[PDB]
Amino acid sequence: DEITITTQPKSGYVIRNKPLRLQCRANHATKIRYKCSSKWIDDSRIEKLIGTDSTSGVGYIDASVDISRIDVDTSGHVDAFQCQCYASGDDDQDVVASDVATVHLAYMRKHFLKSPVAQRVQEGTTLQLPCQAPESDPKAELTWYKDGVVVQPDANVIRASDGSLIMSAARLSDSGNYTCEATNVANSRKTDPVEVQIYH
Amino acid sequence: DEITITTQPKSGYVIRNKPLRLQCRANHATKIRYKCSSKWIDDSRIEKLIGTDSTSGVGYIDASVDISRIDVDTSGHVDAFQCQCYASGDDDQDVVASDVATVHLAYMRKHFLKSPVAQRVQEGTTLQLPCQAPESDPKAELTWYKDGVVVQPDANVIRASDGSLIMSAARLSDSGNYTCEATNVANSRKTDPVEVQIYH
Ligand SMILES: O=C(O)C1=C[C@H](O)[C@@H](OS(=O)(=O)O)[C@H](O[C@H]2[C@H](O)[C@@H](NS(=O)(=O)O)[C@@H](O[C@H]3[C@H](O)[C@@H](OS(=O)(=O)O)[C@H](O[C@H]4[C@H](O)[C@@H](NS(=O)(=O)O)[C@@H](O)O[C@@H]4COS(=O)(=O)O)O[C@H]3C(=O)O)O[C@@H]2COS(=O)(=O)O)O1
Ligand SMILES: *[C@@H]1O[C@H](CO[C@@H]2O[C@@H](C)[C@@H](O)[C@@H](O)[C@@H]2O)[C@@H](O[C@@H]2O[C@H](CO)[C@@H](O)[C@H](O)[C@H]2NC(C)=O)[C@H](O)[C@H]1NC(C)=O
Ligand SMILES: *[C@@H]1O[C@H](CO[C@@H]2O[C@@H](C)[C@@H](O)[C@@H](O)[C@@H]2O)[C@@H](O[C@@H]2O[C@H](CO)[C@@H](O)[C@H](O)[C@H]2NC(C)=O)[C@H](O)[C@H]1NC(C)=O
């Protein structure tokens, strides 16, 4: 009969030393191959699970491969590294190609594009503490910590869309050691603590 | 009132370069400290989240710490590393200690304690292919592959509890290149393919 793809391979990230696993499943197919950016993935790397659907009697083949950082780096198309699945069978059936799955190397650099700095400032002063994550993929999420406690926005302190922390009228209770943390699936990094003194 | 623990710190593994995060949550408490293998965790390392449930009006404190491979290795109790959290508060309230969480370093060695070997054997022979994972913590899980297809136990081939593959009466169709794969949270390893020839 006709070959169609049941599970489509999904884009995703290679994180640290953990390959990205693509899974691809096709009904009425006998062979699945993976081609990634003009190169063919060596068929010995493909882990196949073959059977017949008990309910409908329709055969299937479920193939998965681990795409590694070695693969992406040796491709020649690192910034457009993308993979596809090919379901063939009898001499009479048409090869059916899958969706394109893109594989990216997830990372987070070491240097914060914006980081706070120590301040000694008088009570009532509006103080703004900047923070912007290091260049990262996927995008990072910021959390702010005051002496180890996650800062909770209220009436005087607010988290601004640019990632900074704003205290409208600095209370004495706002003094402390502040740190910004950036997090994504690849790493989690904190600025060195800066000190904030509020006096009168 | 009364201090009680909502989230108990849970045992677990340090995997690769990923610390284990112990989390500990207490009602009506104001401070949580962590002690690990008799040593006290420096309170600047504790990520604390403080608030009031509002639904129940009952205050809480949710504290977390990342236990690293460096922590376990410099402890002096590498094979018995265990941690606890202590939720204090007012000078009037009793310190409440939590469950003991043990931290282990997850690993899996390089060579299999048992691996198959090539066989050329006559049809009808009972054939047994051994496999035992490399020494690993936590315990590893075995998968068998025939030329890349996951072996499905049936009537002639059966997965035995000792990890081996047993073919009661070797059929011609049982010839192929066989591989044993071991998996645990720390790594995944495959024996080199061996060939099994079944003749007449
Ligand atoms: O040029 C480089 O420096 C570099 C190049 C690589 O591109 C890079 O990959 S990336 O994915 O990170 O972008 C690579 O990072 C390595 C790093 O070099 C390793 N160092 S090593 O162990 O000496 O070899 C390593 O270390 C990190 C671990 O996540 C972790 O170690 S442990 O828990 O396994 O013992 C440790 O974690 C810190 C954590 O980062 C802290 N976060 S904070 O925001 O900074 O506060 C905090 O939670 O404490 C823990 C524990 O601290 S302790 O160890 O002092 O107790 O340290 C990390 C580190 O290196 O600083 O792994 C990364 C990732 O490698 S991977 O191959 O991609 O997996 O560096
Ligand atoms: C905020 O931080 C200051 C100083 O931080 C210290 O130095 C850093 C490099 C880091 O190693 C931190 O963990 C240190 O705490 C704190 O002032 C220190 O307080 C301790 C005891 O309270 C004292 O022994 C040190 O000498 C002090 N250091 C200095 C430079 O004065 C301060 O207590 C922290 N908390 C608040 C709310 O400001
Ligand atoms: C079992 O394997 C042999 C050899 O496996 C080859 O070497 C491995 C290291 C790995 O890279 C495999 O992918 C290789 O196939 C097979 O013998 C080969 O058969 C093909 C038939 O298409 C032939 O083109 C090769 O030249 C042969 N190579 C050698 C060294 O003999 C054998 O066919 C496999 N048996 C089964 C049932 O799959």
Side-chain angles (χ1 to χ4, degrees), chain A residues 84-196:
Chain A
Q84 262 183 301
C85 173
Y86 300 95
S88 63
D90 185 20
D91 203 12
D92 296 1
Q93 300 167 315
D94 294 6
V95 176
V96 171
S98 70
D99 296 326
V100 156
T102 72
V103 190
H104 302 272
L105 310 170
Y107 68 95
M108 164 167 331
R109 281 205 192 257
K110 260 185 158 90
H111 179 269
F112 281 62
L113 304 163
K114 301 210 213 69
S115 45
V117 287
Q119 311 249 358
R120 175 177 171 89
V121 86
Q122 197 174 15
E123 179 170 40
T125 291
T126 306
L127 197 50
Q128 178 163 355
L129 305 179
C131 186
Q132 173 174 350
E135 165 183 327
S136 50
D137 186 23
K139 195 189 178 187
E141 277 207 340
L142 301 191
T143 307
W144 274 99
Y145 297 97
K146 177 193 183 298
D147 290 328
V149 308
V150 172
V151 177
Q152 302 288 71
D154 58 22
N156 189 82
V157 307
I158 178 55
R159 288 224 29 203
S161 61
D162 74 5
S164 63
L165 213 50
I166 305 190
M167 313 158 312
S168 39
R171 297 159 302 190
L172 291 169
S173 91
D174 292 322
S175 307
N177 294 303
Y178 287 87
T179 296
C180 182
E181 151 172 299
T183 306
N184 76 358
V185 306
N187 223 322
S188 183
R189 287 180 215 282
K190 305 198 202 182
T191 55
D192 292 355
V194 314
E195 200 178 50
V196 169

Side-chain angles (χ1 to χ4, degrees), chain B residues 27-132:
Chain B
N27 272 332
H28 296 270
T30 76
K31 180 182 178 192
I32 291 185
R33 313 179 54 202
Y34 276 95
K35 185 179 184 174
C36 284
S37 188
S38 71
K39 293 167 61 175
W40 284 103
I41 285 282
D42 183 26
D43 289 357
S44 76
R45 295 181 64 188
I46 295 185
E47 280 178 342
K48 304 159 289 162
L49 176 58
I50 292 169
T52 306
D53 183 75
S54 78
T55 323
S56 75
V58 170
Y60 65 81
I61 169 171
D62 197 293
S64 308
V65 66
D66 289 338
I67 299 309
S68 63
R69 168 185 302 285
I70 305 192
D71 287 329
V72 175
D73 280 333
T74 56
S75 80
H77 305 109
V78 54
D79 42 327
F81 191 85
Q82 57 203 356
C83 296
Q84 264 182 302
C85 52
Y86 305 95
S88 63
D90 183 19
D91 207 12
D92 294 1
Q93 310 168 340
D94 296 5
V95 172
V96 174
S98 69
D99 297 325
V100 153
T102 72
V103 188
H104 304 274
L105 308 172
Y107 69 93
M108 165 163 92
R109 282 207 194 258
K110 247 296 181 10
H111 288 68
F112 284 63
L113 304 165
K114 302 210 281 295
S115 42
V117 286
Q119 311 251 1
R120 172 179 169 88
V121 83
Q122 196 177 15
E123 181 169 42
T125 291
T126 305
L127 197 50
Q128 178 164 356
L129 305 179
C131 184
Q132 175 173 353

